[PDB]
């Protein structure tokens, strides 16, 4: 419960996370990674402006890092 030194004071405004669909299955070799399967939607909480990099999302009430190349950005009608 009790905390020491923590906060969210950093550049970048995130009013809401992003939703991505795992294009392929993945198995986090480390405990800090994330475990998902082709189709499982991952809640992107902290990602970068690069597709060739690992992002941080949330799945099945979990959190970990994973390659963005294993997911895709799915959004509704941009014009409609």
Residue 37: give its domain's CATH number: 2.30.30.40
Using alpha carbons only, what angle is made at residue 24 by residues 33 and 65, rounded to the nearest 5 degrees? 15
Q: Which of 22, 16, 55, 15 is nearest to 36 (CA)?
A: 22
CA neighbours closer than 13 Å in the CB half-sphere of residue 8: 6
When divided into structural domains, the chain yields a total of 1
Residues 50 and 12: their CA atoms lie apart, in Å, by 15
26: tokens are 């993945």
Strands 41-46 and 35-36: unpaired
Range of the domain at 54: 1-80
């Amino acid at each position: 419960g009790s905390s020491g030194s923590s906060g969210h004071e950093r550049v970048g405004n995130l009013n809401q996370p992003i939703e991505v669909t795992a294009l392929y299955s993945f198995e986090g070799q480390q405990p800090g990674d994330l475990n998902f399967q082709a189709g499982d939607r991952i809640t992107v909480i902290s990602k970068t402006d690069s597709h060739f990099d690992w992002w941080e999302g949330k799945l099945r009430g979990q959190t970990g890092i994973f390659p963005a190349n294993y997911v895709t950005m799915n959004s509704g009608p941009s014009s409609g």
